[PDB]
Amino acid sequence: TFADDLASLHNKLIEMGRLTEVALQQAIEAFQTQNANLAMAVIDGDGSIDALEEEVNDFALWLIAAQQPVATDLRRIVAAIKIASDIERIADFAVNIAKACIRIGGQPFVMDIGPLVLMYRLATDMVSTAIAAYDREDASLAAQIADMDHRVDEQYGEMMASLLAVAKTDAATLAQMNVLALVARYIERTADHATNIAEHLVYLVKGKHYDF
Amino acid sequence: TFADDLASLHNKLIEMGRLTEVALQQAIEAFQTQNANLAMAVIDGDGSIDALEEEVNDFALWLIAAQQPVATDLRRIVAAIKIASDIERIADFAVNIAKACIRIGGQPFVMDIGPLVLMYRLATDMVSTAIAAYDREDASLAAQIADMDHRVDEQYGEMMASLLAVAKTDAATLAQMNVLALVARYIERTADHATNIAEHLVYLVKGKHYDF
């Protein structure tokens, strides 16, 4: 049943990702469309993934202590725990982009949220990619994720641009730009995690390190 | 000898941090002073930490499979592996800030690297803090690390500022600003990891989650 166990542990994770995927999808839509009811769907339904992560640690720790995994299987059980956390953190930033969507209520953005939306989706994809890479166990999608990162960078600068330029300085509108800035950061944390997941996937496989 | 084992596993990590600490210290000095010989000290002496991380996984995985850790001890052996990786990644960004220091040779910065230096040190401290928090196992230093983050944020904007403003557009000088931008990102990845380490330390202890 062993081989089967590692197959489910594998699906437990891929599962966390399927959900974090969704949560991410809505978190952004919720924010861009300014949908409070949606932002909440995101919050209320998150502790659920914290649940899966525990499951994934209990299960893995068990194997590591019961079925006595051999080197190779042991690395894939370990990376399984490191990746689960990254999926968890990402999911958490989602919950936060959702709280920020609320922070600002419904008084239409002080500027265009277009580049920010694309910066989010860019990162989101980095996740899908990284998780897909984990699923298939493809250690080469990584270097490709590297580029979506340069894109998240140039996308970011192009954020501070349309932001710290626009003059119309006022308490309410500033408290507004901040939330936008906060969101820009959670998108970069979400990206760095996809990258983190890519690192594991790559070390597990190539024993080498994630490229630029 | 068990209790003793967990004490050394604990010191293995605190050890990785003592070194990553240094590496970080020099990486920045090297860059700000533009010291190639130093940037190299950083590169050449890094595979050494990748070494410690392996040690920390082999050792922990062993306990988890040999001395049969009980719940509490088991969480502290697990977080021990998650944190080791974060220390590893941070150390790696160091190696990269060091490669970027070289990327630009010695033709004095197109602008003032003061705010960037402070943004680096700010993150660096977040690390020391997070690692110190791990050592003592103080789950409250976290919320304090949270603030050094808001500071890393406001410090960042104040980066794009003196950057995308300065007009003097030219191939060499641009290829120059980019490296600076790249460095700004590795500093933010280093911060998000300190934050990551803080998360573990907090979940392990409070079972709850790392604050804003």
Q: Of B57, B61, B149, B174, which to mutate for an interface test with A (greatest number of A Cβ within 10 Å)?
A: B61
Q: Is A178 exposed, middle or buried (0-12, 13-18, 19+ CB in 10 A)?
A: middle
Contact between chains at A196 and B65 (C-beta distance less than 8 A): no
Interior CA angle at B103 toward B182 and B180, to 5°?
30
Asked if residue A167 lies in contact with residue A111, where contact means CB atoms within 8 angstroms, the answer is: no
> Is the Cβ of A7 closer than 8 Å to some Cβ of chain B?
no
Contact between chains at A153 and B209 (C-beta distance less than 8 A): no
Q: Of A189, A195, A200, A206, which to mutate for an interface test with B (greatest number of B Cβ within 10 Å)?
A: A189
Residue B64's contacts (CB-CB under 8 Å, 6 or more residues apart) are A61, A64, A65, B74, B77, B78
Question: How far apart are the two ends of chain B, measured CA to CA in Å?
Answer: 40
Block residue for tokens 């990590």: B13
| Residue A180: Cβ within 10 Å count | 19
Q: Is B168 left (phi over 0), alpha (psi -120 to 50) or beta?
A: left
- Helical H runs in chain A? 2-33, 36-44, 47-65, 71-103, 114-136, 141-164, 171-206
Q: CA distances (Å), B199 to each of A78, A95, A191, B81, B130, in order?
A: 19, 16, 17, 13, 9
Domain boundaries, chain B: 1-212
For CA atoms A166, A167, A172, A175, give the dihedral sign: positive
For CA atoms A175, A180, A186, A188, give the dihedral sign: negative
Of B61, B92, B157, the CB nearest to A164: B157
| Residue A177: Cβ within 10 Å count | 18
Q: Rounded to an integer, what distance in angstroms lies between the CA atom of residue B131 and that of residue A79?
A: 22
Count the residues in chain A. 212
Q: Rounded to an integer, what distance in angstroms lies between the CA atom of residue B71 and that of residue B1?
A: 18
| Residue A188: Cβ within 10 Å count | 24
Determined by X-ray
Size of interface A-B (CB pairs under 8 A): 59
Q: Rounded to an integer, what distance in angstroms lies between the CA atom of residue B27 and that of residue B185?
A: 15
> Is the Cβ of A144 closer than 8 Å to some Cβ of chain B?
no
Asked if residue A184 lies in contact with residue A165, where contact means CB atoms within 8 angstroms, the answer is: no
- Indicate the CATH number for domain B1-212: 1.20.58.220
Q: Rounded to an integer, what distance in angstroms lies between the CA atom of residue A131 and that of residue A2?
A: 23
**Nearest partner of B26 among B120, B112, B131, judged by Cα:** B120
Asked if residue A133 lies in contact with residue A201, where contact means CB atoms within 8 angstroms, the answer is: yes
